[model samples]
Target: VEGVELTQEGMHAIFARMGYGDITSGSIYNGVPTIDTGALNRQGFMPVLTGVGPHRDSGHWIMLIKGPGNQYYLFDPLGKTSGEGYQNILAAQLPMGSTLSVIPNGSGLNMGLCGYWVASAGLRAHQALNQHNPPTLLNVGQTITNEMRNEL
Candidate 1:
């Protein structure tokens, strides 16, 4: 294959050869990834509720991952202690330009604390401990504050 100089035309031509099919021209397009508005109305897209309410014992806590793949990384920007000697989980590998979000599984929905698996550590050893899983026990009155969100 012949190499084309990395110019706008050469780039477009390369993408064309790669079968991207088309590139749109428009003003005000800064290239931030945008989900189509229709995606929000799609059947499986979950609606996000925004407001403050007393955290209730809903069985689980929601962990929003802005994207995919390395969603298990949890960054503790506030230098908070990680119970016992566990190191703080780092942020996941996000694509060059993308975002991700995740919600708690049904069990977590009622526990008030979401169970998350750290990709670095095996999930069975931590997130699925006897007290953390079903037919067991959980911290009933724990609270995750807004400060935690700011840490992200």
Candidate 2:
């Protein structure tokens, strides 16, 4: 089976298609910042899917979400907490030179479609917050995983 990777543009489209409100997406680069702190501060807990690596072509996708005390949490679908994964996040930057700081918040086990799942989880979080319902992170994870399996 072939794995599908999503670009920044594709991620924005996915969120819009799923009825998520306006989101910003842009290229990331080294020695530069990547994230929009103003937007992040304006919209608390906004989901950010970032490509992590020393370079754009050689990287992986990871989800970054705002946490308590103004901290960012890193959710890697592959459950990687050390080595390249950790280093990539530490060294990553957006095209605009925005740096990121995120602490590990557990992990997911899927390989491909990580961006999709992260988007799904973000949508779920949005819905839960808007509807005043509890978060169903586990359920959403399972649901997206199953959907990815079927698609693959």
Candidate 3:
């Protein structure tokens, strides 16, 4: 199977298509090279889709969550195959004392899944505040295709 590479704007489109709109471009999070997860958490857990890169050609999309212990848990749908040293490399992009742990699971898929996982999580975040359900198109399969079947 082939994987898709998405632009920053393209990634945000995935989230919007799923009903989880976020600020795209001009840097969603404050700080350069390092993201301000603190300001991000103010939204009450809107998983952020961020870029992990040596540059766009080698960059990967990741979802960031403010997990327990004031830490940032990173999601890479690309998983292990996303990159070696990704944890450390990504951690560097975060504030001091912040650790980027892979929430769990890894990849047989690559940049392909980068957007979907976070998009689904974004919807759930909305669900968390809204007291409602999420997208069934997830299981419906062909209304769309693959990736992002989050925690219900």
Candidate 4:
């Protein structure tokens, strides 16, 4: 994937195109709130796309998901380990029920397509579950990376 920043609108569009339908988004006009635990739990999982760092600049997009046992996770496509400033900020904003751990699925290449890759990874996992198959984060990461490579 290249260093291309995907907008929130673009993210939603991608998900919709992938057949995820309408996804809930948190914005300033409304408010940045945690995912609905009860509703998402009923669905058995929650896949969220979040933007990290500054609003307009130096921002990276990551995925936050709620899994079984109400456990929460962060999926960082860049696998960056240099900073926790943005991570802490995201932690503070997340729900108390969410876990503080993150699952690193780095792309091995520095790119701005973190949003796209993260969303694609989530979609892969979602589709796997929908098909009643086991979902693996690492596999999803690889699938997306390969797909992007083919596209390029």
lDDT leader:
4
| lDDT, residue 76, candidate 4 | 63
TM-score (C-alpha, index-matched) for candidate 3? 0.46
- Residue range 1-152, candidate 4, lDDT tens digits: 34545565676777688775766643212225354545544443344444433345324455556666646566666555622423564556555766545666566566666677568755766777556766666766667667866755
Once fitted onto the true fold, the runs of candidate 1 whose alpha carbons sit more than 4 angstroms away are: 1-5, 25-152
Worst 10 residues of 1 by lDDT: 82-91
**Arrange candidates by TM-score, highest first: which order?**
4, 3, 2, 1
Predictions in order: lDDT: 0.26, 0.52, 0.51, 0.55
- The candidates, ranked best first by lDDT, are 4, 2, 3, 1
lDDT (10s digit) by residue, model 3, range 14-94: 667877566432232322344444465564333443443334342445666666664776666756654233456556655
TM-scores of the models, in the given order? 0.17, 0.44, 0.46, 0.48
Off by over 4 Å in 3: 1-4, 24-34, 44-58, 81-84, 93-97, 108-152
True lDDT of residue 50, candidate 3 = 45
Off by over 4 Å in 4: 1-4, 27-58, 80-85, 94-97, 111-152
What TM-score quantifies how close candidate 1 is to the native fold? 0.17
Name the candidate that leads on TM-score: 4
Poorest 10 consecutive residues of model 4 by lDDT? 25-34
lDDT of 1 at 142: 18
Could you tell me the lDDT of residue 138 within candidate 4?
73
Tell me how far the alpha carbon of residue 71 in candidate 2 is from the true structure, in angstroms, after superposition.
Answer: 2.9
